[PDB]
Amino acid sequence: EWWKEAVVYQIYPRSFYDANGDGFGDLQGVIQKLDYIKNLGADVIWLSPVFDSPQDDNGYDISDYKNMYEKFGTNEDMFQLIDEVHKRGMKIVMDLVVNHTSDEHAWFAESRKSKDNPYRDYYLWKDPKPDGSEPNNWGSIFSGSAWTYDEGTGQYYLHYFSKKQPDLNWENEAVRREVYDVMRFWMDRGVDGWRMDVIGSISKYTDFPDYETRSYIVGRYHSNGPRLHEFIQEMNREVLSHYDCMTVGEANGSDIEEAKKYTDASRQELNMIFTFEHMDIDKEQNSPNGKWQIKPFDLIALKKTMTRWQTGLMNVGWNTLYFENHDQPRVISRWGNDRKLRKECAKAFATVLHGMKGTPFIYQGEEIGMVNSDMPLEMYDDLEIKNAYRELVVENKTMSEKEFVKAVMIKGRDHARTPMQWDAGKHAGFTAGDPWIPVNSRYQDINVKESLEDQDSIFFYYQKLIQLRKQYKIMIYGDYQLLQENDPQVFSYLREYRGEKLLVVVNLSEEKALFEAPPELIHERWKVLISNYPQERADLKSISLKPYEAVMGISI
Ligand SMILES: OC[C@H]1NC[C@H](O)[C@@H](O)[C@@H]1O
């Protein structure tokens, strides 16, 4: 169970480091930056997908599971990376993307040819309605219908994501066997585990029932299908049980009850899952604009949600801890201050997360406080934006252009995908060429070089949080109790382990706040383990908190 004690660094490789100068981050670039990641202190790297792919969804549309996309390199580069990771005592986790393939995968190129093609049932084909329309009213996560018509065979195929991402038919045992072969191919070559892309979607309701009623709907049927956990238990039996591996499922649609199904060790499924419930607190529940209908940051909602996951998986299963990935904006821009208080704010969110029970995930650039971009809408790359613009602004007019732009400036996935900022030179030192997407305009002030030269950097704060997790067993194995539950500024909680107490107090606001210890804790003596402000005190019975002040103390 080394995965319980791990800290994971997530790499989005096309934006991490470009070794050959074409503006596209590559595998040799990752290799050159492994020493940086090890010095930070992560011991597991999760690579977003580098498999061959036409890049309709930047690698999450896979056309060959057993070869690299040309701009990342060759399998020989991938094998070298695996060796270089292991040489440094680290582990490498790959992205398993098996809810769907590219429509340019050989399986689909065969499948679509005819209803009697041997690969026809590798995907999900349905007749039109009598009037020619789609089999049902299901929507794609990237706007529009979940179905696309094939003129040649007169049937629609299903895609929860883009039209170039047809969903695999997991009802077909041959499909499941192909997936397990891919897993064994890579695990036999040293891959230490898998992050499983939208694993909550692999089981469908084969009736494809309409949602109740907007033309296209995404809801309860898009995840948690009737055979989901049967399939994952099979995957464990056939593959995962045969390897010393780590698994994290990207569990779309997960609540805390579903998380127990996924992560209870006695169920022999996965080690941990990503949920979206803490990421969902700033969208309206059921707007036609989905994620783009933004609500202000609500700390009470964050506290209640994260607390439900800490208590729900306190003594069974295991949590993941994240605020950032390649699908989320920079958290300090989204929910905090990314200007005069950027360093304090970045360290505050880091303290909230890393003081909890679970496996922390650091997204590339989070550890230096990277921020959202001011680039104009036409410089965004993500197909999600182009498609939502068409549906929400042009066709349905449920958002004005101005409000859509404002929402994309807060939540667009490309705020995670601008190049990693290594120094204040050209293109922040990401590339000698022309980057595939613009470098954030603030890179001269925010970059790895200045971070390593500044003892007060966010980077060294993250490095210390990781050191503390390795030093203080209470951080890995202590229980969890929310304090000051209804305080709208202060996120405070207590971990307990073998008579020790860990107190975490974080002001997640720009204004002065007040922490008062619960009365039974007022006479404890504390050693401050970390704070984003200087501390010289052993009593924490009341703390007058400055903007974004974070304190972590251990009882003595
Ligand atoms: O594969 C579809 C979808 N799954 C979730 C991934 O994190 C996201 O980047 C991708 O677009």
Author numbering: 3 to 215, 219 to 561
Article, verbatim:
For MalL, curvature in this plot is very significant, and unrelated to unfolding. This leads to a negative ΔCP‡ value of –11.6 ± 0.4 kJ mol−1 K−1. For example, the large negative ΔCP‡ value for MalL dictates the position of Topt at 320 K, whereas the much smaller ΔCP‡ value for KSI places the Topt well above 320 K (in absence of protein unfolding). MalL samples a larger conformational space than KSI, occupying and regularly switching between a number of structural clusters along the simulation trajectories, related primarily to changes in loops surrounding the active site. Thus, the calculated ΔCP‡ values for MalL converge on a value of −10.0 ± 1.7 kJ mol−1 K−1 (using a window of 70 ns), which is within the error range of the experimentally determined ΔCP‡ value of –11.6 ± 0.4 kJ mol−1 K−1. Analogous to the ligand bound chain of KSI, the catalytic half of the TIM barrel increases in CP at the TS, while more remote protein components, including the second TIM half barrel contribute to the overall negative ΔCP‡. The lid domain, consisting of a helix–loop–helix extension above the barrel, contributes significantly to the overall reduction in CP at the TS, consistent with a role in shielding the active site from solvent at the catalytic step. Analysis of the contributions to these differences show that negative contributions to ΔCP‡ are dispersed throughout the protein and arise from auxiliary domains (MalL) and dimeric units (KSI) not directly involved with the reaction chemistry.
MalL is a large α-glucosidase: it hydrolyses terminal non-reducing (1 → 6)-linked α-glucose residues in a two-step reaction, releasing α-glucose. Here we experimentally determine the value for ΔCP‡ from the temperature dependence of the rate in the absence of enzyme denaturation for two quite different enzymes: the small, dimeric ketosteroid isomerase (KSI) and the large, monomeric α-glucosidase MalL. We recently developed macromolecular rate theory (MMRT), which explains the temperature dependence of enzymes including an intrinsic Topt in the absence of denaturation by introducing the concept of heat capacity changes along the reaction coordinate: the heat capacity (CP) for the enzyme–substrate complex is generally larger than CP for the enzyme–transition state (TS) complex, in enzymes for which the chemical reaction is rate limiting. The active site of MalL (and TIM barrel enzymes in general) sits displaced to one side above the TIM barrel core, interacting with a half of the barrel comprising β5–8 and α4–7.
